[PDB]
């Protein structure tokens, strides 16, 4: 019984999941001066035209927007990836204050939130099998700063009141995740892990350089969600980010000079 508190937070996770102290944990600080430009890198291909959203779920640590991943409808390819990765869900991580909330940091800078588009490698057949592989997932990470509103986020923000507590879901059809992407697909990439238990080291991370802007009112709505179930004492769903972990013997590559 893990979470983000004083008594069950990231600093405790290693007692149940010793992989917490492993060699390829996420997130990490991206030192922009030591990331190396790689001209081997292929351009990223994001193909979201046929994406079929289904449902939005408060899972007690975040909310997830789930997709139909039973065909190649929304796929990531190229960049550092070999093969085809299917979109399964997106979620966010965010803070109690605008000055924290992202998991990755850039030259020690924390953004207000971070969006994770999670994709699994089709060569493994399903998600459950893919997470057991070192190349099973590809997560596209996008930083959020507070400024102007993001119009393409607003459909997500206005359903949040219907999923306030742990275990609530709502139908969430016809959502187009293209509206959450910044103009540029310049990125950094490195091998890492899930950032929640079970902390599996199955992720190729792809972190976009250009943040999206959201409004103060949009972020505020995220902070009204609850970690608890209905009928349990209220605890606001804030600060659901794991802090930066040691880079160890990894290199972060840049797609851009
Ligand atoms: O890294 C995250 O934010 C956590 C995350 C993401 C997607 C799947 C997960 N899972 O535990 O099966 C966990
Ligand atoms: Ni538990
Ligand atoms: Ni995440």
UniProtKB/Swiss-Prot annotation:
Organism per entry: Homo sapiens (Human)
Name recorded for this polypeptide: Carbonic anhydrase 2
Family (UniProt): Belongs to the alpha-carbonic anhydrase family.
Any GO MF annotation of the entry: zinc ion binding
Mutagenesis or variant effect for residue 139 to H: Impaired activity
Listed result of changing residue 59 to H: Reduced proton transfer
Activity regulation info: Activated by X-ray, histamine, L-adrenaline, L- and D-phenylalanine, L- and D-histidine, L-His-OMe and beta-Ala-His (carnosine).
GO cellular component: apical part of cell; cytoplasm; cytosol; extracellular exosome; myelin sheath; plasma membrane
Consequence of substituting residue 195 to D/E: Strongly reduced activity, but enhanced zinc affinity
Impact noted for substituting residue 59 to T: Reduced activity
Gene Ontology biological-process annotations: angiotensin-activated signaling pathway; carbon dioxide transport; morphogenesis of an epithelium; neuron cellular homeostasis; positive regulation of cellular pH reduction; positive regulation of dipeptide transmembrane transport; positive regulation of synaptic transmission, GABAergic; regulation of chloride transport
Consequence of changing residue 59 to D: Strongly reduced activity
Keyword Glycoprotein among record annotations: no
Phosphoserine modifications at: 162, 169
Result, substituting residue 4 to H: Reduced proton transfer rate
Residues noted as binding substrate in the record, renumbered to the chain: 195-196
Keyword tags: Acetylation, Cell membrane, Cytoplasm, Disease variant, Lyase, Membrane, Metal-binding, Osteopetrosis, Phosphoprotein, Zinc
UniProt main location, coarse: cytoplasm
Extra information: Target of drugs used in treatments against glaucoma disorder and breast cancer.
Subcellular location: Cytoplasm; Cell membrane
Phenotype when changing residue 195 to S/V: Reduced activity
Residues with site note (Fine-tunes the proton-transfer properties of H-64): 4, 59, 64
Outcome (variant: residue 194 to F): Normal activity
Reported impact of residue 139 to F/Y: Strongly impaired activity
pH dependence: Optimum pH is 6-8.
């Amino acid at each position: 019984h893990w979470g983000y508190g004083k008594h069950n937070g990231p600093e405790h996770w290693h007692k149940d999941f010793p992989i917490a102290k492993g060699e390829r944990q996420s997130p990490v600080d991206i030192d922009t001066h030591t990331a190396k430009y790689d001209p081997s890198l292929k351009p990223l291909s994001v193909s979201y035209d046929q994406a079929t959203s289904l449902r939005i779920l408060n899972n007690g640590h975040a909310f997830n927007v789930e997709f139909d991943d039973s065909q190649d409808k929304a796929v990531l390819k190229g960049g550092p990836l070999d093969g085809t990765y299917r979109l399964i869900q997106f979620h966010f991580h965010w803070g109690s204050l605008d000055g924290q909330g992202s998991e990755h940091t850039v030259d020690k800078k924390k953004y207000a939130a971070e969006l994770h588009l999670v994709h699994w490698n089709t060569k493994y057949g399903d998600f459950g099998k893919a997470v057991q592989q070192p190349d099973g997932l590809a997560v596209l990470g996008i930083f959020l700063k507070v400024g102007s509103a993001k119009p393409g986020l607003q459909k997500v923000v206005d359903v949040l009141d219907s999923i306030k507590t742990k275990g609530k879901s709502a139908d969430f059809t016809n959502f187009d995740p293209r509206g959450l992407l910044p103009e540029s697909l310049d990125y950094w990439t490195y091998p890492g892990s899930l950032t929640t238990p079970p902390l599996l080291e199955c992720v190729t991370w792809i972190v976009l350089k250009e943040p999206i802007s959201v409004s103060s009112e949009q972020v505020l709505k995220f902070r009204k969600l609850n970690f608890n179930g209905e009928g349990e004492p209220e605890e606001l769903m804030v600060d659901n980010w794991r802090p930066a972990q040691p880079l160890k013997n990894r290199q972060i590559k840049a797609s851009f000079k």
